[PDB]
Structure formats: C-alpha cells, structure tokens
C-alpha cells in the first residue's frame, strides 16, 4: 500500500503491476482522511473466501454473470482491496425484514 | 379623482360562449372554462334555413 | 431598466382574413408577374 501526498508520476505508476503475485495499491492521503466505510449509508461489506463463493453460486444455482456487481474502483472495493472475481456479502438493515444480505461480484 | 375613462359594462369582458352562462360570477373559475368548451357539443337551431 | 415583457398583449398582432389574403395575393401576383416575363422572353413578335 502506497500512501502518497499529491501525485505519483506516470513514470513510477508503470512499475505497479511489474511484480506478480504481489499486488500494489495506491491511495491518496486526502482520500484516506475520512473512512467512508464509517458513513450512515455504508453497510457491512464482507470478503468471501473462494470456497464461500463456490457455495453461494451453488446454493442459488448461479453463473457468476447473474450476480449483482461492484466496480473495481468502488470506494468500498478499494477499501477492502477487492480483486476481480471476489464476491462481497453485504449486510444491510431492511424496513421490510429486519436484516437483508446481498452479494456483489467485483468486476 | 384622476379617472380618464369608464367601463361600458364589465360583462363585455366575456366572449360569445361564456356570455350564455347564467351567474358566471357565482361559479368556480374552471366550471365556466368547461361549459365554454361544452356548448359546442350541444344542439338546438343553428339557422332557420 | 428591466427585461421586456415578451408576453404583453399590446405587443401582439392578430392577422385576420384581410392580411392573410394579402399575403397569398402578393406571392400569387408576383408568380403571374414572372410568368408574363416568360411569354415576353419567348416572344418572336
């Protein structure tokens, strides 16, 4: 995780994917000032294991395609450092049932 | 005191259709607008010939 | 000064049968006027 003040030069930004399987994440200091996950409107997003995901798809009889999606650049996806394919369990309060869990596939 | 002119009759502010409505000054505005449009769907005598 | 009332009735004109007919009669006469010039150009007399 690289926490920069103003900007990372495009010359340096090229080196980012150069070392697999290790992943580099760049966050601006200003962005990190407030933790958006703490917000009123932001529910609990939980990272699912490869096996937990396998089950979710099995149990609902789903293609990965048929799952609701979360952007890679999504403030919460960036916070959890979600990779493509990773599913997130979303626990929100419901005015209808008490609690309601959705799932989003990071694309 | 400054009056330059006097209205001949305020009822002359209405058209041909709204002139037929009895007591239109005793009705809710849209009732008069609605009857204006309706007398066209009526029938009586349009000409003696 | 404040912007002009583009919707004041005094600034509106109602074109009746007269000016409406005047509009056609001008273009119709000028169409015949140029048609007379066709006869005069074709003229060997």
């Amino acid at each position: 995780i690289f926490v920069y003040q103003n900007n990372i030069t495009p010359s340096a930004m090229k080196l980012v994917p150069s070392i697999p399987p290790a992943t580099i994440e760049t966050f601006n200091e200003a962005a990190l000032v407030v933790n958006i996950t703490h917000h009123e409107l932001v529910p609990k997003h939980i990272r699912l294991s490869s096996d937990e995901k396998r089950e979710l798809l099995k149990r609902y009889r789903l293609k990965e395609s048929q799952l609701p999606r979360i952007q890679r650049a999504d403030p919460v996806a960036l916070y959890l450092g979600l990779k493509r394919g990773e599913v997130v369990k979303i626990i929100r309060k419901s005015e209808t049932s008490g609690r309601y869990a959705s799932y989003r596939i990071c694309m | 005191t400054t009056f330059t002119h006097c209205e001949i009759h305020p009822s002359m502010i209405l058209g041909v259709a709204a002139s037929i409505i009895p007591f239109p000054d005793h009705n809710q505005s849209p009732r008069n607008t609605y009857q204006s449009a309706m007398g066209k769907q009526a029938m009586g005598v349009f000409l003696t010939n | 000064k404040d912007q002009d009332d583009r919707d004041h009735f005094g600034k509106k004109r109602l074109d009746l049968a007269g000016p409406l007919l005047a509009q056609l009669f001008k273009t119709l006469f000028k169409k015949l006027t140029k048609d007379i010039f066709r006869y005069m150009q074709r003229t060997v007399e």
Binding site: - | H5, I8, M12, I13, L14, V16 | K12, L14
Partner: protein, 98 residues
C-alpha cells in the same frame, strides 16, 4: 371578448405631416446635448424626431382623434418616465370601446 375589434390599418403620413407642423423637430436636426430632456416621438416604431412640450401635443392629438380627424383606431401613448410618445396606425391591434 364581445366588444373587442381589430385595427384595420390606416395611413401614417397625415399624422407625420400633422406632427412636424405641431412642433416636432427632424431627427437629423436633433442635438442630444442641446435637449436630452426632449420627448422622443415614435410613429409605427419609427423615431421621427423630438417634442419640447409633449403635454400639449398629446392633448392636440387626442381631441383631434375624438373629433374624427385622426382615425379612432390610431393609438397614442405618452410615457412620461421614458420621455416617449408612441403612435400606432398599425393593423392587427386588439382594441375595446370605453
């Protein structure tokens, strides 16, 4: 409305000729710095010139029309604030009797 009518269209020339005789100075001859106060006289949206005593001219015009000498349909307005006198000979104006 029952008593409204529409202006047929009169000739402005007899009014233009009457005005200049009644003290209206030509638009060429106008000197803005020599009379900025002066009322701009307008006939059918045409600035013709200026008038030094617009109050009298306005009365001489109204009584002239009331008599019959200027067609009853010709409209004349005096805007004291903008220092303007607008005259309409113009056809298509909706008008009522009072």
């Amino acid at each position: 409305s029952l008593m409204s009518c529409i202006s047929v269209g009169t000739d402005p020339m007899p009014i233009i000729t009457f005005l200049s005789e009644w003290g209206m100075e030509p638009l060429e001859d106008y000197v803005p710095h020599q009379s900025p106060d002066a009322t701009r006289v307008f006939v059918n949206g045409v600035w013709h010139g200026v008038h030094r005593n617009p109050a009298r001219l306005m009365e001489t015009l109204r009584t002239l029309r009331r008599k019959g000498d200027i067609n009853p349909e010709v409209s004349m307005i005096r805007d004291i604030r903008e220092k303007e006198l607008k005259i309409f000979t113009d056809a298509g104006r909706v008008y009522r009797p009072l």
